[PDB]
Amino acid sequence: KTHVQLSLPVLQVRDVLVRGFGDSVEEVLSEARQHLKDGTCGLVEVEKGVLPQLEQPYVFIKRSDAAPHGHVMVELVAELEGIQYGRSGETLGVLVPHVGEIPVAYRKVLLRK
Ligand SMILES: [C]C1=C(Br)[C]=C([B]([O])=O)S1
């Protein structure tokens, strides 16, 4: 399948224990994809002051289409020092490792793998 239905635990930024996927654009997108597959990926909603509390490179899920079965279609875009690798629609938030933090919600997405 080119696309996978996922339910992502939405985390408060101050609860996040592991605040990034790694050290290069290529590593963060790789690790993001692995954690998404393994169901160990969380989502932090982007607001004023959220991003500076997280580690670069950032991995965003962005809306790729304008919602099969409730699941918003998204794709992965990385950002390092103001440069994005990928081009997509609006940010649904920033992906982070999930290591058992209690979420505040769940975000249903159809991910282009
Ligand atoms: C992002 C990816 C998800 Br979810 C599942 C993959 B697979 O085919 O093993 S790759």
UniProtKB/Swiss-Prot annotation:
It is found in: Host cytoplasm. Residues 2-113 form the CoV Nsp1 globular domain. It comes from the Viruses. Residues 1-113 are annotated as: Disordered. Inhibits host translation by associating with the open head conformation of the 40S subunit. The C-terminus binds to and obstructs ribosomal mRNA entry tunnel. Thereby inhibits antiviral response triggered by innate immunity or interferons. The nsp1-40S ribosome complex further induces an endonucleolytic cleavage near the 5'UTR of host mRNAs, targeting them for degradation. This inhibits the integrated stress response (ISR) in the infected cell by preventing EIF2S1/eIF2-alpha phosphorylation upstream of stress granule formation and depletes host G3BP1. This is Host translation inhibitor nsp1. It comes from Severe acute respiratory syndrome coronavirus 2 (2019-nCoV).
